[model samples]
Target: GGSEFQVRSFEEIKRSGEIRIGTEGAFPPFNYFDERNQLTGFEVDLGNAIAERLGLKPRWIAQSFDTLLIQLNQGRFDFVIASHGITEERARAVDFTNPHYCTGGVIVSRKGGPRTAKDLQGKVVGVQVGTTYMEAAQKIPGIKEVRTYQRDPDALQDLLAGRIDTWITDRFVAKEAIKERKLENTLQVGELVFQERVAMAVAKGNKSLLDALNRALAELMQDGTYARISQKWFGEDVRCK
Candidate 1:
């Protein structure tokens, strides 16, 4: 068949045998360094698997989540490992592969706080900057103040310490933070989840890379690898809507 590989871009790297991956080491479950400071997580492991699929060795560059897109554009990396939500606005700036995980941004409030039950009127909330939750937090009617942080753990710490009345993040991140960190008594999950579906991203117009990502994601999902990784981090299946 002369149809070809359906490659839309980036033929040089595929021929050159190298791929650079960017990731922020702070976010957990998705990508992060462990106590041993090893880059280990669902997304990190998945990235390695994808690199193997492409016949290349994976290399990770740790940076803040806010700067990952910048890194992608600057040619500092070939793709991103952080869990990026797929939206039309974002798609314009960068191309996303097939969705890897489906989850949402959920608000976490200080346990036993009056605002925890219903609304966050006149309450101070904290969110991670450059994340879907930061923009999503503005949707609340009664929220008087919304604080932004560079890291989810820092914002969550303030929420548990009563420094911030509430915090917002992805459901899996929130649940893991609450359970693993033993902060469940101080911070509890709210019923609201604003944004869903997290995926990896590459620079726009890099459809060849996008095609590769889609193939890797499809294989991971068809097999049990995706589910296993999702459960290891989120303790629940995050592969579907």
Candidate 2:
């Protein structure tokens, strides 16, 4: 039997003059709403740039992280530019473009607290639900408890309140939160536990749109647009080697 949903092709998106992009606007420094309540971040800027390269206007739709991929497959968006880490399990659902950035799970804890996996013995850990970090956190030996949150910021808050002994999240996310919240003296970023190549995803079998997106991304990288966006948010290029 044929597929039940229609996947938007590059021609259709071009004819429509806009590409609908999905994201979790709550993930700061990647995709999030600014103080002005405008949706803006590294992924937003990158998506806009990619759309421009394809001669289409970009329309961003912010939704819960766990549901983003599901909505993408439902044909709710042409593509999703959320910070989705490329994984075998996820790859079964959708095809991912080349990685836009690479990062990994890191432990965030009270100063002088656990810095390595071994130190996590008997410690309560907090992680955002439906994230690779959560999987990593759960696998650690002897963790006292694994608490899940809807968002990383909430987990960070709980960690600060001593409700959780450690919070595991993306290294760059941990760094940005620490710097923005001015928690340098109170919080410490610990060792990396898992690495991931983050990418944009298109619905399964939407090869036309996927190819166009990869070409646009390549152009952005070669033309320095990727570097500019990366530098704007992270003060450095975050592309995977």
Give candidate 1's TM-score.
0.89
TM-score list, all predictions = 0.89, 0.96
Which residue window of length 10 is worst by lDDT in model 2?
A: 1-10
Model 2 CA lDDT for position 192: 90
TM-score of 2: 0.96
Best prediction by TM-score: 2
For candidate 1, what is the lDDT?
Answer: 0.78
Instruction: Please write out the lDDT profile of model 2 over residues 67-134, one tens digit for every residue.
Output: 98898999888999989899999999999999999999898899998998999999999988889988
The best candidate in terms of lDDT? 2
Q: How many residue pairs in model 1 have overlapping backbones?
A: 0
- Tens digit per residue, CA lDDT, model 1, 1-241: 1212221355666776767788998888788889998998888888988888778777678888898887686677888879888888788889888788778877778776643424778888899998878877777757788899988889977876778888878888888777787875676687655657788888878878888789878987888887887777667777756
Residue 101 in candidate 2 has what lDDT? 93
